[PDB]
Design a protein around this ligand. Structure first.
Ligand code: PGV
Ligand code: 6OU
Ligand code: 6OU
Ligand code: 6OU
Ligand code: 6OU
Length: 233
């Protein structure tokens, strides 16, 4: 909305933390406060939207529309945490940091699922996501194809010539070129959708990831999100 300046500060420290376990303990105050603040701010997604859609701050109507779609109540967060615990990964360290941050998450206590059950499922998903990003060859080929396509549309050398190398310069580049980066996102997603869904569906099948004891359906999830959220932007 107005002071989305606080989001970029939190984004700087998060990106400063990942650039530099040992770190996580010194920043656990920052990580705990940020999660509780994000979860208690029902308009947080809309502030993120307004960071990249600077025009929205001057359109009261569309801004209010966004609250109907993207605002989440405290109850929504509890329901999501509950739904997150119906995931099982019968196909399968840092568990410690999670098991000492998550108790300090106010809204994770209002639900109070078995924290060991939650820590386990969050820990598994987190290790799958990191391992695949690090090692899935299909995903690396896909990223490289996206990157090469992006580069025929936009001069990455010229972007760095114009000081597009900070997150503030990155946000400002996107938000002043919003239609174009939107069209590039859509064209890349539609061109590569068959392989993206396939990569992710295979990862879930491989690790035998279930939701309420039914196989996860990636096509349905992506299509649900397109219809109910990405299309209302
Ligand atoms: C960790 C949880 C994350 C969950 C989701 C979070 C991700 C958010 C990504 C934000 C990207 C911003 C892009 C905004 C602009 C999108 C386009 C749009 O807003 O509009 C249309 C939306 O439908 C379209 O297909 C647009 C194509 C996009 C559809 C794909 C998005 C699905 C993502 C699923 C995420 C799954 C999460 C868990 C993974 C197992 C574009 O469709 P077209 O009719 O072909 O073209 C016409 C456009 O010119 C009209 O505007
Ligand atoms: C490796 C990383 C793992 C980390 C996991 C964190 C997840 C990160 C992203 C979470 C974004 C989730 C966005 C929700 C999308 C769908 C929301 C939605 O409104 O659709 C509704 C959702 O219904 C569902 O079944 C969704 C089940 C999936 C829940 C997953 C949400 C996880 C949220 C956890 C919050 C983070 C807390 C972290 C600290 C405790 C469908 O409508 P309905 O069937 O009619 O029921 C609702 C009406 N009563
Ligand atoms: C260097 C590493 C950077 C990679 C990630 C980029 C960092 C920033 C990520 C941005 C995520 C923000 C998500 C919410 C943003 C809200 C988007 C939104 O409101 O929608 C549109 C505007 O917002 C945007 O354009 C955000 C687009 C973000 C995508 C940036 C990347 C583009 C494509 C590159 C790679 C393709 C990935 C595809 C994967 C299959 C609204 O369109 P419009 O208002 O109808 O047209 C305006 C004409 N005046
Ligand atoms: C780098 C980004 C990767 C992070 C991914 C971490 C995943 C943690 C958060 C996941 C929440 C995503 C929200 C999904 C919302 C789906 C909307 C929905 O309809 O909910 C339900 C869809 O089913 C679900 O809820 C699925 C539950 C979430 C599964 C999460 C596991 C997928 C992650 C696999 C790992 C992929 C690694 C990717 C690496 C790049 C409706 O199901 P239903 O009630 O049984 O209806 C009948 C079924 N046809
Ligand atoms: C730089 C950061 C990148 C973030 C990129 C996000 C940009 C936005 C792009 C689209 C994201 C799509 C996710 C949709 C989430 C909407 C949640 C929601 O609507 O809550 C409800 C869904 O509730 C659920 O079932 C699951 C609840 C999980 C909600 C968790 C939301 C908190 C997450 C905050 C996200 C913060 C971003 C992280 C970056 C620091 C709506 O359901 P309803 O009761 O049927 O209908 C009532 C309508 N309000």
């Amino acid at each position: 909305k107005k002071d989305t300046n606080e989001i970029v500060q939190d984004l700087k420290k998060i990106l400063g933390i990942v650039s530099l376990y040992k770190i996580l303990m010194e920043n656990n105050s920052f990580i705990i406060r940020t999660i509780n603040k994000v979860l208690a701010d029902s308009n947080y997604i809309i502030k993120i939207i307004a960071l990249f859609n600077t025009d929205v701050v001057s359109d009261k109507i569309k801004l209010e529309e966004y609250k109907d779609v993207f605002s989440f109540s405290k109850e929504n967060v509890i329901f999501g945490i509950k739904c997150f615990c119906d995931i099982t990964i019968d196909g399968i360290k840092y568990v410690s940091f999670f098991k000492k941050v998550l108790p300090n998450i106010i809204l994770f206590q209002t639900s109070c699922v078995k924290t060991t059950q939650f820590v386990n499922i969050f820990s598994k998903l987190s290790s799958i996501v990191y391992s695949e990003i690090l090692t899935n060859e299909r995903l690396h080929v896909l990223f490289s194809e996206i990157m090469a396509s992006f580069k025929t549309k936009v001069s990455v050398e010229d972007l760095k010539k114009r000081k597009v190398n900070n997150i503030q310069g990155l946000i400002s580049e996107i938000s002043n070129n919003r239609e174009m980066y939107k069209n590039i996102f859509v064209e890349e997603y539609e061109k590569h959708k068959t392989t993206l869904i396939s990569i992710v569906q295979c990862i879930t099948d491989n690790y035998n990831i279930n939701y309420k004891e039914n196989a996860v359906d990636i096509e349905f999830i992506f299509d649900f999100i397109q219809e109910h959220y990405i299309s209302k932007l």
